[PDB]
């Protein structure tokens, strides 16, 4: 299972394989942190220890590589 953290919010743990792909994951995470509809452009990043943007890799490699997920503000990057 995989930590997701967002500053000022209590963190959550998800099992990424419960998703078909990135579109399901963005929605579900947006809802969970009471920011519905604000993750289509706030950055959704994950960590391999380099920090990368979620969505570039193939899904299948992503689920096998991801250790942590964060939701970063424009200000935290």
PDB file of N, CA and C in Angstrom:
ATOM      1  N   UNK A   1       0.765  -1.257   0.000  1.00  0.00           N
ATOM      2  CA  UNK A   1       0.000   0.000   0.000  1.00  0.00           C
ATOM      3  C   UNK A   1       0.783   1.287   0.000  1.00  0.00           C
ATOM      4  N   UNK A   2       0.160   2.373  -0.377  1.00  0.00           N
ATOM      5  CA  UNK A   2       0.955   3.503  -0.814  1.00  0.00           C
ATOM      6  C   UNK A   2       0.520   4.810  -0.137  1.00  0.00           C
ATOM      7  N   UNK A   3       1.438   5.528   0.545  1.00  0.00           N
ATOM      8  CA  UNK A   3       1.012   6.765   1.204  1.00  0.00           C
ATOM      9  C   UNK A   3       0.640   7.870   0.238  1.00  0.00           C
ATOM     10  N   UNK A   4      -0.412   8.640   0.520  1.00  0.00           N
ATOM     11  CA  UNK A   4      -0.650   9.908  -0.211  1.00  0.00           C
ATOM     12  C   UNK A   4      -0.760  11.071   0.762  1.00  0.00           C
ATOM     13  N   UNK A   5      -0.009  12.102   0.525  1.00  0.00           N
ATOM     14  CA  UNK A   5       0.051  13.155   1.477  1.00  0.00           C
ATOM     15  C   UNK A   5      -0.142  14.465   0.795  1.00  0.00           C
ATOM     16  N   UNK A   6      -0.702  15.410   1.547  1.00  0.00           N
ATOM     17  CA  UNK A   6      -1.044  16.742   1.009  1.00  0.00           C
ATOM     18  C   UNK A   6      -0.969  17.597   2.247  1.00  0.00           C
ATOM     19  N   UNK A   7      -0.259  18.700   2.129  1.00  0.00           N
ATOM     20  CA  UNK A   7       0.000  19.507   3.294  1.00  0.00           C
ATOM     21  C   UNK A   7      -1.330  20.015   3.895  1.00  0.00           C
ATOM     22  N   UNK A   8      -1.387  19.974   5.233  1.00  0.00           N
ATOM     23  CA  UNK A   8      -2.546  20.449   6.018  1.00  0.00           C
ATOM     24  C   UNK A   8      -3.751  19.509   5.986  1.00  0.00           C
ATOM     25  N   UNK A   9      -3.540  18.344   5.443  1.00  0.00           N
ATOM     26  CA  UNK A   9      -4.622  17.396   5.395  1.00  0.00           C
ATOM     27  C   UNK A   9      -4.021  16.144   6.002  1.00  0.00           C
ATOM     28  N   UNK A  10      -4.878  15.355   6.635  1.00  0.00           N
ATOM     29  CA  UNK A  10      -4.453  14.050   7.109  1.00  0.00           C
ATOM     30  C   UNK A  10      -4.191  13.152   5.908  1.00  0.00           C
ATOM     31  N   UNK A  11      -3.102  12.384   5.995  1.00  0.00           N
ATOM     32  CA  UNK A  11      -2.662  11.545   4.896  1.00  0.00           C
ATOM     33  C   UNK A  11      -3.461  10.282   4.765  1.00  0.00           C
ATOM     34  N   UNK A  12      -3.438   9.652   3.580  1.00  0.00           N
ATOM     35  CA  UNK A  12      -4.198   8.400   3.302  1.00  0.00           C
ATOM     36  C   UNK A  12      -3.323   7.318   2.695  1.00  0.00           C
ATOM     37  N   UNK A  13      -3.810   6.106   2.665  1.00  0.00           N
ATOM     38  CA  UNK A  13      -3.072   5.039   2.003  1.00  0.00           C
ATOM     39  C   UNK A  13      -3.986   4.346   1.035  1.00  0.00           C
ATOM     40  N   UNK A  14      -3.514   4.182  -0.194  1.00  0.00           N
ATOM     41  CA  UNK A  14      -4.324   3.514  -1.192  1.00  0.00           C
ATOM     42  C   UNK A  14      -3.623   2.307  -1.793  1.00  0.00           C
ATOM     43  N   UNK A  15      -4.384   1.349  -2.292  1.00  0.00           N
ATOM     44  CA  UNK A  15      -3.707   0.322  -3.083  1.00  0.00           C
ATOM     45  C   UNK A  15      -3.896   0.654  -4.543  1.00  0.00           C
ATOM     46  N   UNK A  16      -2.801   1.055  -5.181  1.00  0.00           N
ATOM     47  CA  UNK A  16      -2.965   1.556  -6.554  1.00  0.00           C
ATOM     48  C   UNK A  16      -3.588   0.542  -7.557  1.00  0.00           C
ATOM     49  N   UNK A  17      -3.389  -0.744  -7.365  1.00  0.00           N
ATOM     50  CA  UNK A  17      -3.977  -1.720  -8.278  1.00  0.00           C
ATOM     51  C   UNK A  17      -5.505  -1.803  -8.284  1.00  0.00           C
ATOM     52  N   UNK A  18      -6.137  -1.009  -7.416  1.00  0.00           N
ATOM     53  CA  UNK A  18      -7.575  -0.941  -7.352  1.00  0.00           C
ATOM     54  C   UNK A  18      -8.062   0.032  -8.364  1.00  0.00           C
ATOM     55  N   UNK A  19      -7.113   0.585  -9.105  1.00  0.00           N
ATOM     56  CA  UNK A  19      -7.436   1.468 -10.228  1.00  0.00           C
ATOM     57  C   UNK A  19      -7.086   0.912 -11.584  1.00  0.00           C
ATOM     58  N   UNK A  20      -7.951   1.202 -12.554  1.00  0.00           N
ATOM     59  CA  UNK A  20      -7.691   0.969 -13.968  1.00  0.00           C
ATOM     60  C   UNK A  20      -6.559   1.843 -14.507  1.00  0.00           C
ATOM     61  N   UNK A  21      -6.532   3.115 -14.107  1.00  0.00           N
ATOM     62  CA  UNK A  21      -5.508   4.008 -14.588  1.00  0.00           C
ATOM     63  C   UNK A  21      -5.588   5.368 -13.945  1.00  0.00           C
ATOM     64  N   UNK A  22      -4.992   6.343 -14.635  1.00  0.00           N
ATOM     65  CA  UNK A  22      -4.633   7.570 -13.989  1.00  0.00           C
ATOM     66  C   UNK A  22      -5.926   8.354 -13.758  1.00  0.00           C
ATOM     67  N   UNK A  23      -6.880   8.228 -14.681  1.00  0.00           N
ATOM     68  CA  UNK A  23      -8.120   9.019 -14.621  1.00  0.00           C
ATOM     69  C   UNK A  23      -8.995   8.729 -13.396  1.00  0.00           C
ATOM     70  N   UNK A  24      -9.151   7.449 -13.085  1.00  0.00           N
ATOM     71  CA  UNK A  24      -9.729   6.991 -11.857  1.00  0.00           C
ATOM     72  C   UNK A  24      -8.995   7.467 -10.576  1.00  0.00           C
ATOM     73  N   UNK A  25      -7.681   7.290 -10.580  1.00  0.00           N
ATOM     74  CA  UNK A  25      -6.809   7.786  -9.532  1.00  0.00           C
ATOM     75  C   UNK A  25      -6.860   9.317  -9.259  1.00  0.00           C
ATOM     76  N   UNK A  26      -6.889  10.134 -10.301  1.00  0.00           N
ATOM     77  CA  UNK A  26      -6.986  11.545 -10.066  1.00  0.00           C
ATOM     78  C   UNK A  26      -8.295  11.910  -9.448  1.00  0.00           C
ATOM     79  N   UNK A  27      -9.365  11.294  -9.913  1.00  0.00           N
ATOM     80  CA  UNK A  27     -10.672  11.635  -9.384  1.00  0.00           C
ATOM     81  C   UNK A  27     -10.802  11.309  -7.942  1.00  0.00           C
ATOM     82  N   UNK A  28     -10.509  10.033  -7.690  1.00  0.00           N
ATOM     83  CA  UNK A  28     -10.629   9.487  -6.370  1.00  0.00           C
ATOM     84  C   UNK A  28      -9.750  10.261  -5.341  1.00  0.00           C
ATOM     85  N   UNK A  29      -8.496  10.546  -5.673  1.00  0.00           N
ATOM     86  CA  UNK A  29      -7.683  11.412  -4.832  1.00  0.00           C
ATOM     87  C   UNK A  29      -8.179  12.836  -4.673  1.00  0.00           C
ATOM     88  N   UNK A  30      -8.538  13.535  -5.765  1.00  0.00           N
ATOM     89  CA  UNK A  30      -9.261  14.805  -5.654  1.00  0.00           C
ATOM     90  C   UNK A  30     -10.464  14.780  -4.637  1.00  0.00           C
ATOM     91  N   UNK A  31     -11.334  13.766  -4.714  1.00  0.00           N
ATOM     92  CA  UNK A  31     -12.443  13.664  -3.795  1.00  0.00           C
ATOM     93  C   UNK A  31     -11.938  13.515  -2.371  1.00  0.00           C
ATOM     94  N   UNK A  32     -11.043  12.557  -2.166  1.00  0.00           N
ATOM     95  CA  UNK A  32     -10.534  12.253  -0.834  1.00  0.00           C
ATOM     96  C   UNK A  32      -9.961  13.427  -0.087  1.00  0.00           C
ATOM     97  N   UNK A  33      -9.385  14.360  -0.825  1.00  0.00           N
ATOM     98  CA  UNK A  33      -8.833  15.549  -0.201  1.00  0.00           C
ATOM     99  C   UNK A  33      -9.647  16.789  -0.510  1.00  0.00           C
ATOM    100  N   UNK A  34     -10.953  16.588  -0.618  1.00  0.00           N
ATOM    101  CA  UNK A  34     -11.907  17.671  -0.784  1.00  0.00           C
ATOM    102  C   UNK A  34     -11.481  18.751  -1.750  1.00  0.00           C
ATOM    103  N   UNK A  35     -10.804  18.345  -2.821  1.00  0.00           N
ATOM    104  CA  UNK A  35     -10.556  19.234  -3.967  1.00  0.00           C
ATOM    105  C   UNK A  35     -11.094  18.714  -5.375  1.00  0.00           C
ATOM    106  N   UNK A  36     -12.314  18.175  -5.353  1.00  0.00           N
ATOM    107  CA  UNK A  36     -12.972  17.659  -6.546  1.00  0.00           C
ATOM    108  C   UNK A  36     -12.751  18.603  -7.712  1.00  0.00           C
ATOM    109  N   UNK A  37     -12.272  18.029  -8.803  1.00  0.00           N
ATOM    110  CA  UNK A  37     -12.144  18.731 -10.067  1.00  0.00           C
ATOM    111  C   UNK A  37     -10.950  19.654 -10.219  1.00  0.00           C
ATOM    112  N   UNK A  38      -9.968  19.517  -9.343  1.00  0.00           N
ATOM    113  CA  UNK A  38      -8.836  20.437  -9.416  1.00  0.00           C
ATOM    114  C   UNK A  38      -7.600  19.667  -9.740  1.00  0.00           C
ATOM    115  N   UNK A  39      -7.731  18.461 -10.275  1.00  0.00           N
ATOM    116  CA  UNK A  39      -6.516  17.797 -10.742  1.00  0.00           C
ATOM    117  C   UNK A  39      -6.624  17.340 -12.195  1.00  0.00           C
ATOM    118  N   UNK A  40      -6.704  18.316 -13.098  1.00  0.00           N
ATOM    119  CA  UNK A  40      -6.679  18.063 -14.537  1.00  0.00           C
ATOM    120  C   UNK A  40      -5.629  18.870 -15.319  1.00  0.00           C
ATOM    121  N   UNK A  41      -4.874  19.729 -14.637  1.00  0.00           N
ATOM    122  CA  UNK A  41      -4.022  20.711 -15.331  1.00  0.00           C
ATOM    123  C   UNK A  41      -2.566  20.168 -15.233  1.00  0.00           C
ATOM    124  N   UNK A  42      -1.400  23.238  -7.809  1.00  0.00           N
ATOM    125  CA  UNK A  42      -1.769  21.876  -7.477  1.00  0.00           C
ATOM    126  C   UNK A  42      -1.145  20.898  -8.429  1.00  0.00           C
ATOM    127  N   UNK A  43      -0.205  20.106  -7.922  1.00  0.00           N
ATOM    128  CA  UNK A  43       0.482  19.100  -8.745  1.00  0.00           C
ATOM    129  C   UNK A  43       0.336  17.726  -8.162  1.00  0.00           C
ATOM    130  N   UNK A  44       0.057  16.752  -9.000  1.00  0.00           N
ATOM    131  CA  UNK A  44      -0.020  15.430  -8.418  1.00  0.00           C
ATOM    132  C   UNK A  44       1.307  14.661  -8.594  1.00  0.00           C
ATOM    133  N   UNK A  45       2.183  14.615  -7.636  1.00  0.00           N
ATOM    134  CA  UNK A  45       3.450  13.979  -7.930  1.00  0.00           C
ATOM    135  C   UNK A  45       3.687  12.589  -7.201  1.00  0.00           C
ATOM    136  N   UNK A  46       4.658  11.795  -7.614  1.00  0.00           N
ATOM    137  CA  UNK A  46       4.958  10.630  -6.792  1.00  0.00           C
ATOM    138  C   UNK A  46       6.452  10.586  -6.793  1.00  0.00           C
ATOM    139  N   UNK A  47       6.992   9.662  -5.972  1.00  0.00           N
ATOM    140  CA  UNK A  47       8.442   9.452  -5.814  1.00  0.00           C
ATOM    141  C   UNK A  47       8.950   8.037  -6.161  1.00  0.00           C
ATOM    142  N   UNK A  48      10.066   7.971  -6.885  1.00  0.00           N
ATOM    143  CA  UNK A  48      10.631   6.685  -7.286  1.00  0.00           C
ATOM    144  C   UNK A  48      11.576   6.062  -6.216  1.00  0.00           C
ATOM    145  N   UNK A  49      14.581   8.456  -5.382  1.00  0.00           N
ATOM    146  CA  UNK A  49      14.017   9.493  -4.476  1.00  0.00           C
ATOM    147  C   UNK A  49      13.680  10.828  -5.180  1.00  0.00           C
ATOM    148  N   UNK A  50      13.807  10.759  -6.502  1.00  0.00           N
ATOM    149  CA  UNK A  50      13.492  11.901  -7.336  1.00  0.00           C
ATOM    150  C   UNK A  50      11.995  11.950  -7.398  1.00  0.00           C
ATOM    151  N   UNK A  51      11.537  13.173  -7.356  1.00  0.00           N
ATOM    152  CA  UNK A  51      10.143  13.498  -7.501  1.00  0.00           C
ATOM    153  C   UNK A  51       9.587  13.739  -8.963  1.00  0.00           C
ATOM    154  N   UNK A  52       8.696  12.900  -9.430  1.00  0.00           N
ATOM    155  CA  UNK A  52       8.238  12.985 -10.776  1.00  0.00           C
ATOM    156  C   UNK A  52       6.726  13.300 -10.743  1.00  0.00           C
ATOM    157  N   UNK A  53       6.235  13.726 -11.895  1.00  0.00           N
ATOM    158  CA  UNK A  53       4.831  14.126 -12.096  1.00  0.00           C
ATOM    159  C   UNK A  53       3.999  12.903 -12.465  1.00  0.00           C
ATOM    160  N   UNK A  54       2.840  12.769 -11.872  1.00  0.00           N
ATOM    161  CA  UNK A  54       2.098  11.496 -12.020  1.00  0.00           C
ATOM    162  C   UNK A  54       1.368  11.531 -13.375  1.00  0.00           C
ATOM    163  N   UNK A  55       1.483  10.468 -14.217  1.00  0.00           N
ATOM    164  CA  UNK A  55       0.843  10.431 -15.505  1.00  0.00           C
ATOM    165  C   UNK A  55       1.766  10.236 -16.713  1.00  0.00           C
ATOM    166  N   UNK A  56       3.082  10.422 -16.588  1.00  0.00           N
ATOM    167  CA  UNK A  56       3.984  10.292 -17.731  1.00  0.00           C
ATOM    168  C   UNK A  56       4.292   8.896 -18.122  1.00  0.00           C
ATOM    169  N   UNK A  57       4.513   8.038 -17.148  1.00  0.00           N
ATOM    170  CA  UNK A  57       4.824   6.672 -17.429  1.00  0.00           C
ATOM    171  C   UNK A  57       3.618   5.890 -17.758  1.00  0.00           C
ATOM    172  N   UNK A  58       3.823   4.760 -18.444  1.00  0.00           N
ATOM    173  CA  UNK A  58       2.768   3.755 -18.556  1.00  0.00           C
ATOM    174  C   UNK A  58       2.255   3.343 -17.180  1.00  0.00           C
ATOM    175  N   UNK A  59       0.930   3.168 -17.079  1.00  0.00           N
ATOM    176  CA  UNK A  59       0.267   2.740 -15.861  1.00  0.00           C
ATOM    177  C   UNK A  59       0.944   1.580 -15.196  1.00  0.00           C
ATOM    178  N   UNK A  60       1.118   0.531 -15.957  1.00  0.00           N
ATOM    179  CA  UNK A  60       1.703  -0.708 -15.504  1.00  0.00           C
ATOM    180  C   UNK A  60       3.070  -0.632 -14.846  1.00  0.00           C
ATOM    181  N   UNK A  61       3.923   0.258 -15.330  1.00  0.00           N
ATOM    182  CA  UNK A  61       5.249   0.542 -14.731  1.00  0.00           C
ATOM    183  C   UNK A  61       5.100   1.415 -13.482  1.00  0.00           C
ATOM    184  N   UNK A  62       4.205   2.392 -13.595  1.00  0.00           N
ATOM    185  CA  UNK A  62       3.824   3.216 -12.455  1.00  0.00           C
ATOM    186  C   UNK A  62       3.345   2.436 -11.192  1.00  0.00           C
ATOM    187  N   UNK A  63       2.496   1.429 -11.369  1.00  0.00           N
ATOM    188  CA  UNK A  63       2.057   0.704 -10.198  1.00  0.00           C
ATOM    189  C   UNK A  63       3.188  -0.118  -9.618  1.00  0.00           C
ATOM    190  N   UNK A  64       4.217  -0.413 -10.413  1.00  0.00           N
ATOM    191  CA  UNK A  64       5.310  -1.287  -9.973  1.00  0.00           C
ATOM    192  C   UNK A  64       6.464  -0.481  -9.454  1.00  0.00           C
ATOM    193  N   UNK A  65       6.337   0.833  -9.539  1.00  0.00           N
ATOM    194  CA  UNK A  65       7.450   1.705  -9.207  1.00  0.00           C
ATOM    195  C   UNK A  65       7.167   2.708  -8.073  1.00  0.00           C
ATOM    196  N   UNK A  66       5.889   2.935  -7.818  1.00  0.00           N
ATOM    197  CA  UNK A  66       5.469   4.031  -6.964  1.00  0.00           C
ATOM    198  C   UNK A  66       5.614   3.696  -5.466  1.00  0.00           C
ATOM    199  N   UNK A  67       6.180   4.634  -4.710  1.00  0.00           N
ATOM    200  CA  UNK A  67       6.349   4.383  -3.302  1.00  0.00           C
ATOM    201  C   UNK A  67       5.559   5.345  -2.460  1.00  0.00           C
ATOM    202  N   UNK A  68       5.578   6.595  -2.895  1.00  0.00           N
ATOM    203  CA  UNK A  68       4.832   7.637  -2.221  1.00  0.00           C
ATOM    204  C   UNK A  68       4.151   8.540  -3.219  1.00  0.00           C
ATOM    205  N   UNK A  69       2.992   9.087  -2.865  1.00  0.00           N
ATOM    206  CA  UNK A  69       2.306  10.102  -3.728  1.00  0.00           C
ATOM    207  C   UNK A  69       2.078  11.353  -2.903  1.00  0.00           C
ATOM    208  N   UNK A  70       2.251  12.516  -3.521  1.00  0.00           N
ATOM    209  CA  UNK A  70       1.980  13.755  -2.845  1.00  0.00           C
ATOM    210  C   UNK A  70       1.149  14.654  -3.715  1.00  0.00           C
ATOM    211  N   UNK A  71       0.377  15.455  -3.003  1.00  0.00           N
ATOM    212  CA  UNK A  71      -0.235  16.575  -3.676  1.00  0.00           C
ATOM    213  C   UNK A  71       0.425  17.921  -3.283  1.00  0.00           C
ATOM    214  N   UNK A  72       1.246  18.432  -4.203  1.00  0.00           N
ATOM    215  CA  UNK A  72       1.970  19.664  -3.989  1.00  0.00           C
ATOM    216  C   UNK A  72       1.265  20.851  -4.493  1.00  0.00           C
ATOM    217  N   UNK A  73       1.328  21.945  -3.714  1.00  0.00           N
ATOM    218  CA  UNK A  73       0.899  23.298  -4.194  1.00  0.00           C
ATOM    219  C   UNK A  73       1.915  24.008  -5.138  1.00  0.00           C
ATOM    220  N   UNK A  74       1.405  24.952  -5.938  1.00  0.00           N
ATOM    221  CA  UNK A  74       2.266  25.803  -6.782  1.00  0.00           C
ATOM    222  C   UNK A  74       3.442  26.365  -5.959  1.00  0.00           C
ATOM    223  N   UNK A  75       3.133  26.660  -4.703  1.00  0.00           N
ATOM    224  CA  UNK A  75       4.072  27.205  -3.750  1.00  0.00           C
ATOM    225  C   UNK A  75       5.111  26.202  -3.186  1.00  0.00           C
ATOM    226  N   UNK A  76       4.793  24.921  -3.151  1.00  0.00           N
ATOM    227  CA  UNK A  76       5.730  23.975  -2.574  1.00  0.00           C
ATOM    228  C   UNK A  76       6.774  23.449  -3.568  1.00  0.00           C
ATOM    229  N   UNK A  77       6.581  23.748  -4.848  1.00  0.00           N
ATOM    230  CA  UNK A  77       7.505  23.304  -5.886  1.00  0.00           C
ATOM    231  C   UNK A  77       8.524  24.388  -6.218  1.00  0.00           C
TER     232      UNK A  77
END
